């Protein structure tokens, strides 16, 4: 079974090298997540275009095929557009457009490192595009569509540096809520899971805005939630730790180093505050998509 949402000129050109399990195998391989599996490969039919074909494994429900084609025809310009869905019979691949630049989280370790750089305007230009992209999602379209797994790895940057958000989740064909939050910690992710899910086992609109506050604070701190120096500090978490750098007397603190003297901390400063209420544990006390890009485009 095959859909095709882009213009892709040819069904089997696509598919005749997905089909083929040893064909992977001599694959680049892009992005890395143990059970989920991303590839890097280059379209035959098309005049050398890169595609990114991520491998997602679930564990005669048609629901999957539902929501994947509702996913499909969603275009926003802050949302990475879904090209193709392969549905092997315990399998399922998801076709995006290879993007060079990278995802956020992988701009941000190479910054750490020292190998990229990237200055607050852009991080602003990126918060607003995530903003923007849950807001359409979470307010704008037919259907209410919830993103289960945001995190910066899932925000790519195209030519123009807008944030896209790809790789949704999908109530079907998510794991079960224990094992989810076992395979987030060894991912590293669990900061981004909001604290009422561990009650719940319900991704809500909530939780894609604590998903986002979190990301927030990242690109102010410069610093991931899996970063062993928040487990030497006191709040042993990168919202707590936050929460308190904003109320006390020296909030730069924060801030990561490499953006204090080019004259954005006033604005990097609001934008640990908007961080705070996206992270508040009580989600009724959190802000949605749309009061949350008014205030990142307040500044
Ligand atoms: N269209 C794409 N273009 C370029 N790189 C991509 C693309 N999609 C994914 N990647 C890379 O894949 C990496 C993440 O791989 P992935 O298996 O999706 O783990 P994850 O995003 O952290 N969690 P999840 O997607 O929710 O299962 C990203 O950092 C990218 O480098
Ligand atoms: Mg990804």
Known sequence: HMSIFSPLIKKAEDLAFLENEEALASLEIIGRGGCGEVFKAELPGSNGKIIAVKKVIQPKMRQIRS?????????????????????RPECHYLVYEYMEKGSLQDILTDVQAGNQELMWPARHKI???????????HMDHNPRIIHRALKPANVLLDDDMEARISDF???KAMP??????????????????????????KFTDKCDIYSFGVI???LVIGKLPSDEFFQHTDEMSLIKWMR????SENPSLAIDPKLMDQGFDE?????????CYCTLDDPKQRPNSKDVRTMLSQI
Do not use: C, W
Request: overall charge negative.
């Open 176 to 201: 079960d809520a224990v094992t989810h939050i076992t395979t987030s910690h060894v991912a590293g992710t669990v900061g981004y899971i909001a604290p009422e899910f561990y009650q719940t086992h």
């Open 67 to 87: 929501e994947i084609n509702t996913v499909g025809h969603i275009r926003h310009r802050n949302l990475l557009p879904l090209l193709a869905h392969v549905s």
């Open 169 to 171: 989740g999908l109530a």
């Open 244 to 247: 308190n750098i904003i109320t």
């Open 216 to 218: 927030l604070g990242i």
């Open 267 to 275: 604005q990097m400063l609001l934008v640990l505050k908007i961080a």
């Open 127 to 137: 918060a607003l595009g995530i903003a923007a992209g849950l807001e359409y999602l």
